[PDB]
Amino acid sequence: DELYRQSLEIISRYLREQATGAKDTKPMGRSGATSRKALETLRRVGDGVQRNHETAFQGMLRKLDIKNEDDVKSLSRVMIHVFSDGVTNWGRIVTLISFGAFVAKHLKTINQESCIEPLAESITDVLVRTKRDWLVKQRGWDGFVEFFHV
Numbered sequence: 001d002e003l004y005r006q007s008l009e010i011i012s013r014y015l016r017e018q019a020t021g022a023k024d025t026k027p028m029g030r031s032g033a034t035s036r037k038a039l040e041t042l043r044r045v046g047d048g049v050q051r052n053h054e055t056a057f058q059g060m061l062r063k064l065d066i067k068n069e070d071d072v073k074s075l076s077r078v079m080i081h082v083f084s085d086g087v088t089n090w091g092r093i094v095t096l097i098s099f100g101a102f103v104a105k106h107l108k109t110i111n112q113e114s115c116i117e118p119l120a121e122s123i124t125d126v127l128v129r130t131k132r133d134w135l136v137k138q139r140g141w142d143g144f145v146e147f148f149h150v
């Protein structure tokens with residue numbers, strides 16, 4: 001599963017940099033030019049997705065009532081339910097990830113930073129397992145980077 005692997009590399013870094021405010025500096029296994037540009041794109045558009053969904057994101061986080069790893073482990077089904085409504089596009093993929101950054105930041109705030117890694121794992125698992133056909137047609141992260149170009 002190359003698409004899982006790549007998806008995980010991008011999402012884990014973006015959540016950690018959103019949570020920490022630290023530009024992530026962990027090297028990947030090798031050059032990933034698309035992966036670095038996809039992180040750049042999340043940086044640029046992810047931030048403003050959160051500012052436009054400030055109200056629904058807080059209301060969603062309220063409901064979820066997240067305090068720990070058991071809780072982070074128990075999000076998969078709700079994630080799926082909300083995400084597979086309507087129809088698939090890159091805007092909703094950004095929403096998923098950007099809400100992921102919102103919850104990451106919540107986790108740091110509640111001193112549960114070590115949960116960000118499994119949270120990134122859950123989002124990747126759901127993304128690839130629910131939207132695989134569509135991502136493969138859209139050419140994955142290159143498609144993503146082209147869609148929000150400049």
Ligand SMILES: O=C(O)c1ccc(-c2cccc3c(CCCOc4cccc5ccccc45)c(C(=O)O)nn23)cc1
Nearest residue numbers: 056057060075078079082083092095096099100103123
């Ligand atoms: O009435 C509105 O305007 C509105 C807009 C957006 C949302 C909303 C909030 C959070 C996430 C999310 C998504 C992403 C799918 C599920 O994401 C998640 C749901 C639950 C927990 C999650 C934890 C981490 C990452 C995503 C999560 C979508 C969408 O599909 O359009 N819409 N949302 C809810 C209500």
